[PDB]
Amino acid sequence: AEVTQLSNGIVVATEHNPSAHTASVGVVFGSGAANENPYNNGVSNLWKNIFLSKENSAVAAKEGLALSSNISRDFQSYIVSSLPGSTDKSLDFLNQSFIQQKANLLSSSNFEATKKSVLKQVQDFEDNDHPNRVLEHLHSTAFQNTPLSLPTRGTLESLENLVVADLESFANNHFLNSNAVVVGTGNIKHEDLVNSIESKNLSLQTGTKPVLKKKAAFLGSEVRLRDDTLPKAWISLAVEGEPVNSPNYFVAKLAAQIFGSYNAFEPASRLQGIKLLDNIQEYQLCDNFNHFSLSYKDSGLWGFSTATRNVTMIDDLIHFTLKQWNRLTISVTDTEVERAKSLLKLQLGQLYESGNPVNDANLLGAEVLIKGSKLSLGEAFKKIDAITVKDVKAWAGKRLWDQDIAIAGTGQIEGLLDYMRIRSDMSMMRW
Amino acid sequence: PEHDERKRLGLKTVIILSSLYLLSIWVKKFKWAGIKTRKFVFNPPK
């Protein structure tokens, strides 16, 4: 329940939990796919893949350490998990790979075998993971010609034309000290870790700052990846959401909980206290849907994603869903808000407190990099419970009502009507 | 006998209709902007 963080030469952030059997240690850099270019796009993902290379991974396996990495938009992270006792040997492997082997991982035999793996990896994604593929393209069109548009896994064309020098160039511009935070989760104490860190000196590229860019911006638009050979239609639609560290950060997430997620095959899901379900179940407008409030450093996306085999009624799916969202500005009820608060706490809890320290590190790391600290789970609940119907209405009237949208879809989307028809539904006629 | 009055009414009728005409052109172009500037790309399937 304690979020301890101190700075000496490097910023150290930890969160202890004695009941945890293992401990995870790692470095989280304040730069991700949002820092790349259209041409070196996929370099971060490539780094992650060599860090988990058979060679580097075997060295950690002998020592009894497990490797894990995650490439996001605003950040990047390299994590090593171990037993509570080997909390020192994780730091040896961390330093040995980011300073000593910052040239042994980049061999012309390791790099090629890895490049061939991320190529089959990113290709498999585009060929089969339609829901995530669609969600990735949603960011692509919504934030076109802006940092948030670049996909995390990179594109096949920028990937196959990438070389060892590109990795180095990126590493020497972002893997800096002022653009880093060392994180530790599990059971180890803050004072326990900071000592092993403040022990080993050496700055290594100190005072150096990463390159700057241009601010991210939402552009109402769409990308339609029609493919009549797929057995379904997958669509994602959203408005400009909230950036992390926004006053309405929670109002937005609550609003998404009101409509929540659905799965037509799960008996219990068909019974949720969601008004939209009365409309969509009559003719079974979809197999599933899920709302989200994605937040990043400069912006975010608020909307929903859905999958359906009812290809001749896609317009009803979109129409009923948008009519429900209209409600947030004009008629959302106290009980809908209250139901959302309870369910938001339950999901926010299950995230911030899972039985896995690697998840804790990513959540902690990502937060401290943006606001310099982490809001305690109990602090969130105070903010969540304080939200009134009046708040949700003021938010919706600014973010949802008669606002541009961004759309992306693949599969049998002939039935997804034109942009203007969808856009017109972002409001209602009144006297 | 309706000559003077007929032309007076015509003046009002023609002004309103002219405006409505010019105005509808503008509204139509706006409603069609997404379609007119729409762009396609073909990547032949493997």
C-alpha span between A369 and A31 (Å, rounded): 10
Domain that holds residue B44: 2-46
Interface test mutation site (partner A, options B37, B38, B46, max chain A beta carbons within 10 A) = B38
Q: Are residues A169 and A93 in the same domain?
A: yes
Q: Are residues A261 and A379 in the same domain?
A: yes
Q: Count the alpha carbons within 13 Å of A416 in the hemisphere toward its beta carbon.
A: 27
Determine the distance in angstroms separating the CA of B41 from the nearest CA of chain A, rounded to an integer.
10
Nearest CA in chain B to A220: B34
Are A328 and A335 contacting, i.e. CB atoms less than 8 angstroms apart? no
Are A410 and A314 contacting, i.e. CB atoms less than 8 angstroms apart? no
Cβ of B31 within 8 Å of Cβ of A420? The answer is: yes
Q: For residue A351, which of A314, A330, A380 has the smallest C-alpha distance?
A: A380
Number of domains composing chain A: 2
Contacts of B35 in chain A (CB under 8 A): 418
Nearest CA in chain A to B39: A223
Domain that holds residue A152: 1-202
Number of domains composing chain B: 1
Scan residues 9-38 of B and list those with Cβ closer than 8 Å to A.
31, 34-35
Q: Are residues A187 and A215 in the same domain?
A: no
C-alpha span between A143 and A301 (Å, rounded): 10
Handedness of CA A250, A252, A255, A256 (dihedral sign): negative
Instruction: Kindly give, in sequence order, each residue whose CB lies less than 8 Å from that of residue A138, ignoring residues fewer than 6 positions away.
Output: A223, A236, A237, A238, A301, A303, A305, A406, A407, A408
Nearest CA in chain A to B30: A420
- Tell me, what amino acid is at A51? F
Cβ of A418 within 8 Å of Cβ of B35? The answer is: yes
DSSP one-letter string for A122-142: HHHHHHH-HHHHHHHHHHHHH
Burial class of residue A399 in the structure, from the number of CB atoms within 10 Å of its CB (0-12 exposed, 13-18 middle, 19+ buried): buried
**Resolution of the structure, angstroms:** 2.3
* Experimental method of this PDB entry: X-ray
Residue B39 sits in a domain whose CATH number is: 1.20.5.100
Q: Are residues A194 and A219 in the same domain?
A: no
Each residue of A186-220: b (16+ CB within 10 Å) or e? bbbebebbbebbeeeeeeeeeeeebeeeeebbbeb
Query: Across the A/B interface, how many CB contacts are shorter than 8 Å?
Result: 5
Scan residues 208-267 of A and list those with Cβ closer than 8 Å to B.
none
Which of A161, A183, A202 terminates a domain? The answer is A202
Contacts of B34 in chain A (CB under 8 A): 418-420
Scan residues 408-427 of A and list those with Cβ closer than 8 Å to B.
418-420
Residue A289 sits in a domain whose CATH number is: 3.30.830.10
Instruction: Kindly give, in sequence order, each residue whose CB lies less than 8 Å from that of residue A25, ignoring residues fewer than 6 positions away.
Output: A79, A80, A81, A82, A87, A90, A91, A94, A182, A183, A184, A186, A188, A193
User: A291 by DSSP, 3-state: which?
Assistant: strand
Interface test mutation site (partner B, options A419, A422, A423, A424, max chain B beta carbons within 10 A) = A419
Residue A266 is given by DSSP the state: -
Q: Where are the alpha helices (DSSP H) in A353-418?
A: 357-371, 377-385, 389-399
Which of A169, A202, A235 terminates a domain? The answer is A202
Residue identified by tokens 């989280």 is: A28
Q: Are residues A181 and A287 in the same domain?
A: no
Q: Are residues A305 and A412 in the same domain?
A: yes
Residue A293 is given by DSSP the state: E
Contacts of A418 in chain B (CB under 8 A): 34-35
Which of A153, A175, A202 terminates a domain? The answer is A202
Determine the distance in angstroms separating the CA of B24 from the nearest CA of chain A, rounded to an integer.
17
Q: Which helix (H) or strand (E) holds A203?
A: none
Determine the distance in angstroms separating the CA of A77 from the nearest CA of chain B, rounded to an integer.
34
Take residue A358 and report the two structure tokens written for it.
């690697």
Asked if A401 has any chain B CB less than 8 Å from its own CB, the reply is no
C-alpha span between A333 and A274 (Å, rounded): 12
Q: Are residues A224 and A360 in the same domain?
A: yes
Contacts of A419 in chain B (CB under 8 A): 34
Q: Are residues A98 and A213 in the same domain?
A: no
C-alpha span between A265 and A257 (Å, rounded): 20
Determine the distance in angstroms separating the CA of A362 from the nearest CA of chain B, rounded to an integer.
37
∠ Cα A318 A320 A321 (to 5°): 65
Are A179 and A32 contacting, i.e. CB atoms less than 8 angstroms apart? no
